[PDB]
Ligand binder design. Structure first.
Ligand SMILES: [K+]
Ligand SMILES: [Mg+2]
Ligand SMILES: [Mg+2]
Ligand SMILES: [Mg+2]
Ligand SMILES: [Mg+2]
Ligand SMILES: [Mg+2]
Ligand SMILES: [Mg+2]
Ligand SMILES: [Mg+2]
Ligand SMILES: [Mg+2]
Ligand SMILES: [Mg+2]
Ligand SMILES: [Mg+2]
Ligand SMILES: [Mg+2]
Ligand SMILES: [Mg+2]
Ligand SMILES: [Mg+2]
Length: 95
RNA sequence: GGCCGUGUGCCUUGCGCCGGGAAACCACGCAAGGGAUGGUGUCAAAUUCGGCGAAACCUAAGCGCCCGCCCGGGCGUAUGGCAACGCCGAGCCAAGCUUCGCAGCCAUUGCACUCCGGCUGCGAUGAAGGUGUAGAGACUAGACGGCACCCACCUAAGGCAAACGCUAUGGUGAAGGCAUAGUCCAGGGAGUGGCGA
RNA sequence: AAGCCACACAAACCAG
RNA sequence: CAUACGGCC
């Protein structure tokens, strides 16, 4: 379902075969139509595989991303999005 | 093939010893013997270039002594040389391991911000051990070699235990592979030709 | 000298 | 005990 608003969004249920360095650019171009993107974290580890965190400059870029991109097929797989349960280390150094 | 001897590598015993180790025991220095040194699989590849050392042993230019002197000689000696062998820089290497890529399958629906699941497959780099290092050398093979286990003996740090204590990822079960076993091919056996003293 | 290098070469044997 | 060296068979 949904959680409570955040600067960063939690993306899961991805295709686990797409490589780290390739996927970043496939995310930096597709989501930049909501606003500016700060950083995209992707790990291929057993725990973090098929998961991605996308950090925007403002909430407006992330809130619309939750609605406009909910269910979008990405490499023949549905894209599930939730709000982040924590604030990113990239964000914590400013506030 | 045997018997005596010298050297060097070896192990055992009985000595020394601010080294490492928790102990076993390893390493170090020497001296006297040859009684002893467990097992099964696996790996067979690279085998290039270039420097550093050696004992006995063989020989005697130079130099020393001597045959009173020269002419010959004689005696000592390595600094010359053979060579068991001890090793250094660079390049390459099989399987087993450290770490990385890509592919393949099995898992995994997982909230991270430091990196990270397991296999089998090539390719890659790490640390061993090789190789260079045979009588110039060519080639087969397993071993005394690299590797995983297996067994006997010793110790027990850590882990286990209330506890006498249990337990090996720690020791001990030699060195030989500067060619070991083989089959070749140098070499001597057995010729002249230089160089050398 | 001991030994080294080049060419030539018959055996069993010795042969790292 | 192994390698190599000096003798001897
Ligand atoms: K000690
Ligand atoms: Mg014996
Ligand atoms: Mg070959
Ligand atoms: Mg003289
Ligand atoms: Mg004279
Ligand atoms: Mg003499
Ligand atoms: Mg000498
Ligand atoms: Mg050499
Ligand atoms: Mg060789
Ligand atoms: Mg060898
Ligand atoms: Mg041989
Ligand atoms: Mg001859
Ligand atoms: Mg030899
Ligand atoms: Mg030998």
């Amino acid at each position: 379902p949904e959680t409570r608003p955040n600067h960063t969004i939690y993306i899961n249920n991805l295709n686990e075969k797409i490589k780290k360095d390739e996927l970043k650019k496939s995310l930096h171009a597709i989501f930049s139509r909501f606003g500016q993107i700060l950083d995209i974290l992707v790990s291929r580890s057993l725990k973090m595989r098929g998961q991605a965190f996308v950090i925007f400059k403002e909430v407006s870029s992330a809130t619309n991303a939750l609605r406009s991109m909910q269910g979008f097929p990405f490499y023949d797989k549905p894209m599930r999005i939730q709000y982040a349960k924590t604030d990113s280390d990239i964000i914590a150094k400013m506030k």
